[PDB]
């Protein structure tokens with residue numbers, strides 16, 4: 019019943035789960051999957067999973083579609099290539115490195131390939147419960163030492179539909195194809211409407227500065243425009259420390275939310291649990307209707323944030339802030 | 352008084368300085384430099400600095416050589432391109448992303464260019480005190496909020512006294528493809544070996560260099576960046592050390608080495624206990640400094656942590672772990688103790 023758990027709970031409650039906790043681990047070939055937030059733990063709001071894997075010369079999965087789930091690919095570290103296509107639109111591919119993001123709405127064909135030896139892919143899937151597929155195809159892993167990974171169609175019920183006619187394009191240059199795309203060389207926009215895949219390289223997407231509680235920079239990844247009926251938001255939030263004269267705000271939202279620290283040290287105080295400090299890869303989950311406070315102990319922290327509903331923490335900070343063109347906040351309060 | 356400090360001390364002593372602490376910050380144009388370890392703070396053993404900067408369409412510094420300093424470029428986050436050339440050898444260039452490493456021995460022409468918006472370059476220079484150059488080039492920055500960087504002839508002689516020798520004829524090559532040039536190079540697509548020849552620059556992509564597994568105090572994986580082979584008389588080692596937790600049945604070892612050493616956490620949560628100071632837990636980018644001859648203990652509270660480690664001398668912690676370990680081909684440690 020303590021706040022920190024080794025596997026996500028089997029019912030909705032506040033919790034924190036450390037990076038590389040057991041988290042119902044399974045392996046699929048050389049890949050190791052951890053389920054930090056599950057359907058049961060989030061009341062089916064979303065799934066937050068981590069995949070660690072070594073370099074592979076082959077695709078990590080055969081090309082496929084999910085008709086009822088929206089997947090979000092975030093590169094925690096290392097690098098992996100992601101391919102995506104909607105309808106008959108041109109097929110897109112990007113090589114994601116640390117902090118890069120790839121959006122895969124429902125009905126978008128996709129696959130990936132792990133490039134670097136110490137690669138970690140954080141997946142946020144909406145709605146929650148998609149992890150059953152990985153329990154099913156996976157082999158349970160005890161992983162006593164908590165090592166990141168181990169050194170070395172008919173799945174319609176799980177919402178997986180094969181796309182055997184898809185051929186991942188092979189004309190990648192400087193991490194992107196086709197050639198007329200912007201990747202780490204300029205600004206990236208979110209898709210103009212729902213249904214289309216899109217990618218945002220670390221620090222190149224739109225940002226908003228909120229100065230109500232110290233400085234926080236929200237970099238939206240998914241908004242109402244893209245989520246539509248899937249009804250969620252996703253972004254990174256970067257944070258300064260909170261000045262001594264500023265009260266750390268208490269929040270209570272209609273929907274569940276969660277974050278995974280990427281950089282820095284973030285303290286979270288949820289419900290009646292102790293204020294707890296989270297470091298890299300650690301995850302905090304807050305049920306809808308539960309009060310919480312968070313602040314950065316580090317001088318700069320950045321977290322990956324997901325929320326069920328259209329008016330979660332990220333959107334609130336955006337609406338209370340202003341457009342902003344830097345990954346850094348002002349030097350003066 | 353307090354193990355944690357906001358600026359590197361003006362003398363040798365155990366300390367920890369948190370990521371983005373003031374650290375006697377200066378700005379050089381859009382770049383913000385923090386001096387986590389200085390000549391005075393390390394007894395002149397080495398300098399460890401952090402440079403945070405936005406994308407630039409221009410070189411971050413005019414091409415130059417240092418005759419008496421060995422520089423080490425480590426990419427904490429973001430990305431920057433680095434060019435390097437030893438004498439008449441082929442000019443090399445790589446685009447470094449998170450966890451990538453570039454080695455620049457004495458007498459090697461080099462320059463860099465910041466590519467990504469949130470870029471952080473950790474520089475380790477031997478011997479220490481090299482930072483005086485940046486005190487001169489730079490303008491003091493108060494940076495009250497500790498933001499990573501601030502949003503939006505005559506010199507010839509001066510620069511030489513700082514061990515900076517301009518190479519005006521050097522033209523950084525412009526035929527980069529997939530983050531590397533020339534074509535016959537290995538970058539994120541295969542193993543990188545440390546240079547077998549002293550004086551030659553070399554690069555190691557994250558996780559692609561040689562590694563060693565030490566199983567004496569839990570699992571630790573050392574990934575050497577600089578060894579005696581390369582350092583020679585500069586007399587130091589540089590590597591990353593990855594760590595598992597320490598099993599309850601294993602005693603966390605107490606270490607002491609003649610030379611000063613230091614580390615900056617890259618990933619995870621690492622507890623350090625130095626001398627008679629209280630144990631302190633370090634996170635992303637935090638730096639711990641241990642004077643030579645001072646006893647210290649460290650362990651990882653995270654299930655996996657990785658630190659960038661530098662040591663003065665030929666047989667510091669990283670070399671010790673290697674000597675007590677075995678060749679290893681994975682960035683992960685075994686699943687069983």
Ligand SMILES: *[C@@H]1O[C@H](CO)[C@@H](O[C@@H]2O[C@H](CO)[C@@H](O[C@@H]3O[C@H](CO)[C@@H](O)[C@H](O)[C@@H]3O)[C@H](O)[C@H]2NC(C)=O)[C@H](O)[C@H]1NC(C)=O
Nearest residue numbers: 099113131186187188189190191192193194195528529534
């Ligand atoms: C830059 O790096 C990219 C990878 O990000 C390299 O792309 C790779 O290019 C090779 C050679 O063209 C492709 O392999 C070839 O694919 C064709 C088509 O299937 C096949 O007929 C050949 O037998 C060979 O296997 C490879 O698929 C492609 N990889 C990706 C992910 O696109 C690119 O070549 C690099 N450029 C340079 C100049 O180094």
Ligand SMILES: *[C@@H]1O[C@H](CO)[C@@H](O[C@@H]2O[C@H](CO)[C@@H](O[C@@H]3O[C@H](CO)[C@@H](O)[C@H](O)[C@@H]3O)[C@H](O)[C@H]2NC(C)=O)[C@H](O)[C@H]1NC(C)=O
Nearest residue numbers: 191192197432446464523524525526527528529530531532
């Ligand atoms: C892949 O990305 C690389 C950068 O990593 C691109 O290399 C860049 O290529 C351009 C044009 O060839 C170079 O600019 C040119 O430089 C010359 C010489 O100074 C000048 O005469 C031209 O006016 C122009 O400015 C650029 O310097 C070079 N960058 C680097 C760092 O090498 C490459 O073009 C990309 N390849 C593809 C297919 O996208």
Ligand SMILES: *[C@@H]1O[C@H](CO)[C@@H](O)[C@H](O)[C@H]1NC(C)=O
Nearest residue numbers: 084085086123124125126213
């Ligand atoms: C996805 O495709 C299926 C089958 O064509 C279709 O029934 C469904 O409406 C699509 N869903 C969305 C959200 O477009």
Ligand SMILES: *[C@@H]1O[C@H](CO)[C@@H](O)[C@H](O)[C@H]1NC(C)=O
Nearest residue numbers: 043045157158159160161162
């Ligand atoms: C999977 O679970 C079974 C049943 O409890 C166990 O015996 C086996 O060792 C597990 N496999 C792994 C790889 O952890």
Ligand SMILES: *[C@@H]1O[C@H](CO)[C@@H](O)[C@H](O)[C@H]1NC(C)=O
Nearest residue numbers: 249272273274306326327328
């Ligand atoms: C969106 O999610 C919020 C928060 O969970 C929920 O209260 C609301 O009913 C949802 N809206 C729709 C139309 O489902």
Ligand SMILES: *[C@@H]1O[C@H](CO)[C@@H](O)[C@H](O)[C@H]1NC(C)=O
Nearest residue numbers: 417418419456457458459550
């Ligand atoms: C570097 O070059 C200088 C000037 O040519 C030379 O005097 C010195 O011996 C060289 N140093 C090293 C370590 O090679």
Ligand SMILES: *[C@@H]1O[C@H](CO)[C@@H](O)[C@H](O)[C@H]1NC(C)=O
Nearest residue numbers: 375376377486489490491492
């Ligand atoms: C810059 O800071 C240094 C170190 O504290 C100080 O010695 C120097 O005088 C400062 N420069 C100015 C102009 O104040």
Ligand SMILES: *[C@@H]1O[C@H](CO)[C@@H](O)[C@H](O)[C@H]1NC(C)=O
Nearest residue numbers: 586609610611643663664665
């Ligand atoms: C190398 O450094 C160590 C530790 O500071 C020192 O004890 C040793 O004498 C040095 N060796 C040389 C050749 O300077």
Ligand SMILES: CCN(CC)C(=S)S
Nearest residue numbers: 069079089090141142
């Ligand atoms: C394994 C990556 N993934 C989960 C985000 C899919 S291919 S759906």
Ligand SMILES: CCN(CC)C(=S)S
Nearest residue numbers: 402412422423474475
């Ligand atoms: C600022 C980068 N640098 C220090 C490592 C040199 S060009 S010497």
Ligand SMILES: [Cu+2]
Nearest residue numbers: 082084089128
């Ligand atoms: Cu999928």
Ligand SMILES: [Cu+2]
Nearest residue numbers: 415417422461
């Ligand atoms: Cu230099």
